[PDB]
């Protein structure tokens, strides 16, 4: 439950924010792994 709530809160924390249009490769990799890790935690979490 706590892991699901932390995931949804961090995704809304990303859903706030300042929006960039252009990104370098290394930081966009970290963004993709971050949000993919988040919803992956979610879709595991609701089943558990």
């Amino acid at each position: 439950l706590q892991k699901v709530k932390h995931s949804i809160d961090q995704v809304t924390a990303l859903s706030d924010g300042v929006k960039p249009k252009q990104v370098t490769k290394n930081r966009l990799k970290e963004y993709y792994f971050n949000i993919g890790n988040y919803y992956s935690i979610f879709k595991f979490g609701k089943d558990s």
Partner: protein
């Protein structure tokens, strides 16, 4: 809310670049749930120390002398991870300090005033503390402040991090004295470059940087290093011609906020990937942007500092004493006529009581400082609050390994020549009931036990050595069903069966009811199957020799001792079957106080010793109420030891071999610290 992260503290932009590559590589290796590096740029190292103490930063690398600056309040730092300089075949924790000069300059070390000197920094170890310490007492008064006096000693110099505004001579060769890599003269190779430019006449660096900067052999054949006995040698006999050894550089972090484990995991993966050229695509110890960034160049790996060792135990005693006399600015004369009073050490309200009474009955030569456990008091002797202590041979092994010497031994036999005769050493036995005659040495498994204290001779070393040959396992709460051995860990059954309450069970002081000799015997009588004591225990607790009730009712013809082959021998004959011999208890102290402890204690044993009858009402030094406090209760006199003052010559070959057989099972953290200090 929010997860773990590691942050590092940076000095300049080169540290930010190297820290940036370090971030991307260490986020490349670790899984996404593991924490990564961050980079926080600060201007100087001292501002970085206050950045750690005010929790903006977590870790940063310092020298030894700078560790002494970071130790102080309100900073409250702690050394957590050191680094070794040798190959992985043999790690070396200390490194040398040398002074490189130009060929054919032709000047001695002693008359070195009025020359150009280049220092690697203010307060650093091989740059500042050793040269000013060796040159220190030759300067005239006023010596405080130090930078003014050294500024008048040389005719101008370079020393970064020194204050240019209050002292202009320290920046006379370096126009800005800046605590960063932006200064080209800052650092080891900056000081060697200060010699290589010819602007500096003498430089002070480690033994390896002249091998770092110069690749040609003739360039090495030019530059020379001066010796301490005013001679000259070339470079590669730095093991022959050095000034002093210093401890290595150390990653420091704060004490309460932590955290040691996370830094040590991260730097474990760092040392396993990047140290000894496993990867070409990134190096951790060398970098093209600059040298000595974030770490040293001559480092080859990281060693964990044990949790016991804080900064004063890390630097040693001579180094802290020298650096404190150098900060405070005092050249000791010490003519050595009279003796300052000895600060004896006690523990927990019975030793402290007795020690205070002896401090008043003596005219003032003895004063008392208390600790709680005996390991903590031995550490309190090492860093320097306490002078002398009497403790058994199993702790003369530990304290002797930590760097202390025994002076006077205890005698147990009454004679006219007891003060000079080296006695032989007492016997250790195991006492069993008469009510159980089925007990043999061949079968001790699953049956109860009683020990005096963890780490002692007759309670620990002599039993668990001879047992350790047979069991061949390092744990012991599996071989015994349960027992009593105070000083073990609280999860065990060994601390579970013991007596004291509340929260004082298994605590190794006199507040444990089953502690020590008489307490182990009371463990045997009340709840015990076998006990492990000295041979002298049963006639001293037999037959109303104690006014205590439980010892008043007992007799010795019941309580019998068992042998090694299994055959029960009666109590009066101990020599036919002793478990093993144990050396006498001895008084240990630091090496510099050996003469005053010797001269004072020989005076004190005459006035209050064993010839003083009418013991009740007046003072007796050795007689106690069978708590066996400050000294064993049956001591007659204390023997003067000439020619045998080390731990190994005092304890002897068979016993040192026995503890050496036990050595991989000892869990005392102070032994781990005093072993880690060794190279």
């Amino acid at each position: 809310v929010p997860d773990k992260t590691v942050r590092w503290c940076a000095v300049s932009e080169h540290e930010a670049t190297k820290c940036q590559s370090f971030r991307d590589h260490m986020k490349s290796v670790i899984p996404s749930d593991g924490p990564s590096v961050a980079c926080v740029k600060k201007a100087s190292y001292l501002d970085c120390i206050r950045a750690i103490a005010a929790n903006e930063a977590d870790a940063v690398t310092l020298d030894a002398g700078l560790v002494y600056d970071a130790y102080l309040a309100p900073n409250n730092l702690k050394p957590v991870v050191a680094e070794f300089y040798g190959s992985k075949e043999d790690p070396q924790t200390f490194y040398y300090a040398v002074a490189v000069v130009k060929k054919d300059s032709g000047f001695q070390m002693n008359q070195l005033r009025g020359k150009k000197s280049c220092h690697t920094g203010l307060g650093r170890s091989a740059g500042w503390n050793i040269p000013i310490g060796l040159l220190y007492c030759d300067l005239p008064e006023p010596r405080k402040p130090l930078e003014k006096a050294v500024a008048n000693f040389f005719s101008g110099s370079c020393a970064p991090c020194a204050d240019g505004t209050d002292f202009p001579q320290l920046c006379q060769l370096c126009p800005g004295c800046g605590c960063s890599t932006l200064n080209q003269y800052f650092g080891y190779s900056g000081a060697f470059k200060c010699l290589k430019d010819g602007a500096g006449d003498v430089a002070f660096v480690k033994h390896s940087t002249i091998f770092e900067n110069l690749a040609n052999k003739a360039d090495r054949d030019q530059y020379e290093l001066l010796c301490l006995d005013n001679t000259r040698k070339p470079v590669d006999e730095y093991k022959d011609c050095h000034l002093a050894q210093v401890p290595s550089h150390t990653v420091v972090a704060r004490s309460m906020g932590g955290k040691e484990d996370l830094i040590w995991e991260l730097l474990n993966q760092a040392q396993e990937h990047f140290g000894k050229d496993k990867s070409k695509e990134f190096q951790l110890f060398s970098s093209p942007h600059g040298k000595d960034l974030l770490f040293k160049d001559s480092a080859h790996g990281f060693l964990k500092v044990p949790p016991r060792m804080d900064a004063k135990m890390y630097l040693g005693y001579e180094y802290v004493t020298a650096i404190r006399n150098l900060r405070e600015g005092t050249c000791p004369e010490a003519p050595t006529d009279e003796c300052k009073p000895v600060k004896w050490c006690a523990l927990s309200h019975h030793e402290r009581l007795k020690c205070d009474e002896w401090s008043v009955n003596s005219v003032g030569k003895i004063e008392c400082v208390s600790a709680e456990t005996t390991e903590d008091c031995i550490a309190k002797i090492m860093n320097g609050e306490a002078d002398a202590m009497s403790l058994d041979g199993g702790f003369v092994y530990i304290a002797g390994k930590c760097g202390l010497v025994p002076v006077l031994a205890e005698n147990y036999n009454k004679s006219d020549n007891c003060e000079d005769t080296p006695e032989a050493g007492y016997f250790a036995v195991a006492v069993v009931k008469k009510s159980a005659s089925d007990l043999t040495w061949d079968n001790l498994k699953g049956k109860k036990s009683c020990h005096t204290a963890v780490g002692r001779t007759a309670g620990w070393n002599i039993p668990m050595g001879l047992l350790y040959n047979k069991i061949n396992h390092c744990r012991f709460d599996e071989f015994f069903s349960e027992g009593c051995a105070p000083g073990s860990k609280k999860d065990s059954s060994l601390c579970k069966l013991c007596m004291g309450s509340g929260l004082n069970l298994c605590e190794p002081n006199n507040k444990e009811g089953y502690y020590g000799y008489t307490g182990a015997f009371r463990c045997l009588v009340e709840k015990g199957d076998v006990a492990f004591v000295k041979h002298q225990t049963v006639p001293q607790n037999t037959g109303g020799k104690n006014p205590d009730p439980w010892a008043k009712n007992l007799n010795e013809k019941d309580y019998e001792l068992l042998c090694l082959d299994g055959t029960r021998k009666p109590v009066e004959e101990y020599a036919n079957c002793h478990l093993a011999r144990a050396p006498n208890h001895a008084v240990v102290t630091r090496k510099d106080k050996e003469a005053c402890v010797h001269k004072i204690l020989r005076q004190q044993q005459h006035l209050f010793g064993s010839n003083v009858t009418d013991c009740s009402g007046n003072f007796c030094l050795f007689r106690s109420e069978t708590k066996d406090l400050l000294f064993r209760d049956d001591t007659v006199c204390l023997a003067k030891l000439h020619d045998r003052n080390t731990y190994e010559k005092y304890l002897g070959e068979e016993y040192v071999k026995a503890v050496g057989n036990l050595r991989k099972c000892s869990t005392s953290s102070l032994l781990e610290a005093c072993t880690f200090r060794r190279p």
